[PDB]
Design a protein around this nucleic acid. Sequence first.
RNA 1: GCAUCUAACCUCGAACCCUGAAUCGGGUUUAGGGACAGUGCCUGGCGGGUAGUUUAACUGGGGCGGU
RNA 2: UACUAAAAACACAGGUCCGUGCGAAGUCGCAAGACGAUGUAUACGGACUGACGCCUGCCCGGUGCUGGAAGGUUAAGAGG
RNA 3: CCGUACCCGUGUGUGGGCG
RNA 4: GGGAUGAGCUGUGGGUAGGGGUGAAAGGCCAAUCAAACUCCGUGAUAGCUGGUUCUCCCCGAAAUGCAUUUAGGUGCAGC
RNA 5: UAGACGGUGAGAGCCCGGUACGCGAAAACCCGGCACCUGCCUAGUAUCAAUUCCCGAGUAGCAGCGGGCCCGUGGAAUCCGCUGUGAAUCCGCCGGGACCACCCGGUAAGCCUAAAUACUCCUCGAUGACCGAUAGCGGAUUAGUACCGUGAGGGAAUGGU
RNA 6: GGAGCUGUCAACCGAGCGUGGAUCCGAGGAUUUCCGAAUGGGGAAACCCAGCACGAGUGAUGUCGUGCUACCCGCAUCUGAAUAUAUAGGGUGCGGGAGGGAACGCGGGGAAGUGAAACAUCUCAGUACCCGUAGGAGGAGAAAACAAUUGUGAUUCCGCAAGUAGUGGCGAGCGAACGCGGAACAGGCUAAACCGCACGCAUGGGUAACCGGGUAGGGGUUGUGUGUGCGGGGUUGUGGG
Lengths: 62, 47, 95
Amino acid sequence: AAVCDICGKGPGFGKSVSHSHRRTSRRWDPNIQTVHAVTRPGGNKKRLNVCTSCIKAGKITR
Amino acid sequence: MKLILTADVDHLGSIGDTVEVKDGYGRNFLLPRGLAIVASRGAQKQA
Amino acid sequence: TLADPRDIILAPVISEKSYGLLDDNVYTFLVRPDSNKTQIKIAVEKIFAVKVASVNTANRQGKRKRTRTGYGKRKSTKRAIVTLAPGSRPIDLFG
RNA sequence: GCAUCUAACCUCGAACCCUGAAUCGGGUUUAGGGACAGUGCCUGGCGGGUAGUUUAACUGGGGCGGU
RNA sequence: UACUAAAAACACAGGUCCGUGCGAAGUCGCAAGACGAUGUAUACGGACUGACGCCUGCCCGGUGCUGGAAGGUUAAGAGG
RNA sequence: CCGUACCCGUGUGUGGGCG
RNA sequence: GGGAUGAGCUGUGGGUAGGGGUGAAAGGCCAAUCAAACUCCGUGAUAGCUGGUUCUCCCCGAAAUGCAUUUAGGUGCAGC
RNA sequence: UAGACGGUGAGAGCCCGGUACGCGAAAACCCGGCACCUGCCUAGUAUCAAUUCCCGAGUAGCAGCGGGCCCGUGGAAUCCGCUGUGAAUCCGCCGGGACCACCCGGUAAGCCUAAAUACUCCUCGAUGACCGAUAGCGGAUUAGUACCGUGAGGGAAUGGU
RNA sequence: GGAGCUGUCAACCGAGCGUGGAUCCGAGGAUUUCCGAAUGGGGAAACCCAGCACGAGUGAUGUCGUGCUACCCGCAUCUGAAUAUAUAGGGUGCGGGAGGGAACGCGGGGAAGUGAAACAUCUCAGUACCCGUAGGAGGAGAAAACAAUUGUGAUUCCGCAAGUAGUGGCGAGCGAACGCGGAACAGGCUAAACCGCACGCAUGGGUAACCGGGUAGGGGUUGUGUGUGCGGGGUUGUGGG
Ligand SMILES: [Mg+2]
Ligand SMILES: [Mg+2]
Ligand SMILES: [Mg+2]
Ligand SMILES: [Mg+2]
Ligand SMILES: [Mg+2]
Ligand SMILES: [Mg+2]
Ligand SMILES: [Mg+2]
Ligand SMILES: [Mg+2]
Ligand SMILES: [Mg+2]
Ligand SMILES: [Mg+2]
Ligand SMILES: [Mg+2]
Ligand SMILES: [Mg+2]
Ligand SMILES: [Mg+2]
Ligand SMILES: [Mg+2]
Ligand SMILES: [Mg+2]
Ligand SMILES: [Mg+2]
Ligand SMILES: [Mg+2]
Ligand SMILES: [Mg+2]
Ligand SMILES: [Mg+2]
Ligand SMILES: [Mg+2]
Ligand SMILES: [Mg+2]
Ligand SMILES: [Mg+2]
Ligand SMILES: [Mg+2]
Ligand SMILES: [Mg+2]
Ligand SMILES: [Mg+2]
Ligand SMILES: [Mg+2]
Ligand SMILES: [Mg+2]
Ligand SMILES: [Mg+2]
Ligand SMILES: [Mg+2]
Ligand SMILES: [Mg+2]
Ligand SMILES: [Mg+2]
Ligand SMILES: [Mg+2]
Ligand SMILES: [Mg+2]
Ligand SMILES: [Mg+2]
Ligand SMILES: [Mg+2]
Ligand SMILES: [Mg+2]
Ligand SMILES: [Mg+2]
Ligand SMILES: [Mg+2]
Ligand SMILES: [Mg+2]
Ligand SMILES: [Mg+2]
Ligand SMILES: [Mg+2]
Ligand SMILES: [Mg+2]
Ligand SMILES: [Mg+2]
Ligand SMILES: [Mg+2]
Ligand SMILES: [Mg+2]
Ligand SMILES: [Mg+2]
Ligand SMILES: [Mg+2]
Ligand SMILES: [Mg+2]
Ligand SMILES: [Mg+2]
Ligand SMILES: [Mg+2]
Ligand SMILES: [Mg+2]
Ligand SMILES: [Mg+2]
Ligand SMILES: [Mg+2]
Ligand SMILES: [Mg+2]
Ligand SMILES: [Mg+2]
Ligand SMILES: [Zn+2]
């Protein structure tokens, strides 16, 4: 997964550049991690894939 | 982030005081189990 | 907005086979192509006030016809061949 | 570093529920694994598997030889 | 080898080697998923050989593959 | 169409039977 | 002439799609086309190569050499 | 105020349709006005003083890898993406082409905003030192038709008493 | 509007209509099969098969007519599995979306042939094409702007600046901006500080408060702090309550 379910952050598109400066397309995927998030304490878990930026923030709970 | 721990956590602190942990311990063990909360407004309630 | 059977039944077929069947009290009608035997039965029975023994239907493709601008098809038709009860009164078709 | 732990995370182990029909899916519980793995970013290696290409000219034809 | 080659070519049963301990290896897919297989090493995949008989000698230097990690070399990172 | 069938469904009667 | 109970033939319905498929392997076959189908589009591709380039008259009128060249049937400059 | 144009049996201002010009709309739609309606204001102002608080975050900055700017990474500024790290709220923060000091400028990480700009499937009205049936649209004609192709697609020819 | 008319290939007829105003022209409405986003379900598009409700019909099954019946999203209500809180899910009711359109817009993905007399950097070209998504336009837009000692003052677009500064296997090529002249001009709304109202959470009973401020008593615990909602207020760079 390369899309965050909270902030919608997706992959960027750019180039891998060789020493000969040949540039081929590649992606910069967000650091998407699976979380089992809860809405209220003790509640049912829901599987999301969110970026480590949202995990570092308080956007999700476990 | 800093957590005010409501419960008593061994070699981590007693009730009420604020203690800083390495952010994985807090959000994967302390917050889920109600042992601690994040310090935003609780200082005024404690004092 | 109320429907009636005089619009399910369009016209009688006029042909030598039509007359041959008229001799034995069997009448062939041009009917609306989307109709079925049962509404033909009810329709004839309440239009001509007769007892319909059986209705036989045949779908007939329109004739394809050459013309100076191209080929055109005639209407596709549906015959209903209606045989009345053995003793029910013949319908008066006026010709 | 090593070991242990479990709570992240993982399980195509099991049971239950959505489910009326479900070898899908999800959730709950459990049995394990477990901060490993996988994944993101960075990074070395390897890489005709694939791709784009290059691979000179002279020459008593061209190649070979020579230049 | 449709349409100039039917063969001595391919396949084959048999052989051997290598891989694979199981959503295996391999393969198709970015993934999920699928085939493998509703199979489980007497199985599956790849390679070469090619019924059967008698056999299959020497070389591990090169290049691969397998294993090992004492030391040399080295990227990012850290460091400063 | 004639002769003779078979299948599904519907309604109305009659008979006796089971509840 | 070969096979003709078989690794058989065949119908119907379906699946695999282009660097892909499928191939008892011939680079075979994938709609009479295949060492990468076809169609449209980029597109009026590009071609130092071949061909073609349409009325008239008047004046003058070459070159096929040198130098350099991934150059030698091209081109630049010189010469004319 | 009409000599635009076309038609009419051959070059028509006065024959016809018209043309200049002048009128014209039940209704619908558009436009505008008046009402009705809706919303805002009827309590603040000035000064003093600067003791206190306020200005939008996983953002900026920094590091890596890229993209984009004249800039093809270069000393690379400004801007954008992903990864990591990760602030401060004005005695802050950003820019002024590395950077530092000073000075100048501005207040990022919320949103909305007319006009000048682009376009013409389509509707009217004109126009052409544009074409005139091998031309002009492929199509004056059955025209995206016939026909060709399994299909995507390709695609004509044919006007004049 | 005013005498012809029943469209056209396209003649022939036939049969009629029209000053009691036809044909014809404008506007509004009515009808509007089936397919198609196609949406009751299915399907080889234009076909097949329904369910429900209400009517019609039959002696009754048959049959006919009219509505409704896809999925997803949002909102509002009911219920709340494993399992308790609950949630997932489910029921109902309202709304909305879907698809198409010649060009123009914005964001994203993104070739090659070609040029470099080869070719990979580079070019072609952010082109073709594709994806998403509009609107009558769009995007941009109200300074974290430029500029450089006096300054300009949102954006867009046009002309210059300029094939310049530069940038380039410094090759092929690529190529600004400052600023100037014009078209047109326009600026606003959002948090907190802080303040009331309601909800939830924590604390205490003469500790204290509190009951609009001052003056006295009375009540004699509903204050205070906080998170969540509603409002005010503020919205600025000469910094702004
Ligand atoms: Mg997703
Ligand atoms: Mg890009
Ligand atoms: Mg390129
Ligand atoms: Mg980040
Ligand atoms: Mg951390
Ligand atoms: Mg019969
Ligand atoms: Mg039949
Ligand atoms: Mg004929
Ligand atoms: Mg890693
Ligand atoms: Mg190659
Ligand atoms: Mg090339
Ligand atoms: Mg040569
Ligand atoms: Mg020679
Ligand atoms: Mg042959
Ligand atoms: Mg032969
Ligand atoms: Mg074998
Ligand atoms: Mg083995
Ligand atoms: Mg595998
Ligand atoms: Mg071998
Ligand atoms: Mg062999
Ligand atoms: Mg040997
Ligand atoms: Mg050895
Ligand atoms: Mg019979
Ligand atoms: Mg024979
Ligand atoms: Mg023989
Ligand atoms: Mg034989
Ligand atoms: Mg060969
Ligand atoms: Mg062929
Ligand atoms: Mg090719
Ligand atoms: Mg081009
Ligand atoms: Mg002469
Ligand atoms: Mg010359
Ligand atoms: Mg004239
Ligand atoms: Mg960066
Ligand atoms: Mg750059
Ligand atoms: Mg700000
Ligand atoms: Mg703002
Ligand atoms: Mg805007
Ligand atoms: Mg505008
Ligand atoms: Mg216009
Ligand atoms: Mg016009
Ligand atoms: Mg033509
Ligand atoms: Mg055909
Ligand atoms: Mg009319
Ligand atoms: Mg109308
Ligand atoms: Mg349907
Ligand atoms: Mg359907
Ligand atoms: Mg419950
Ligand atoms: Mg749309
Ligand atoms: Mg290229
Ligand atoms: Mg080239
Ligand atoms: Mg060339
Ligand atoms: Mg706009
Ligand atoms: Mg100006
Ligand atoms: Mg508020
Ligand atoms: Zn995120």
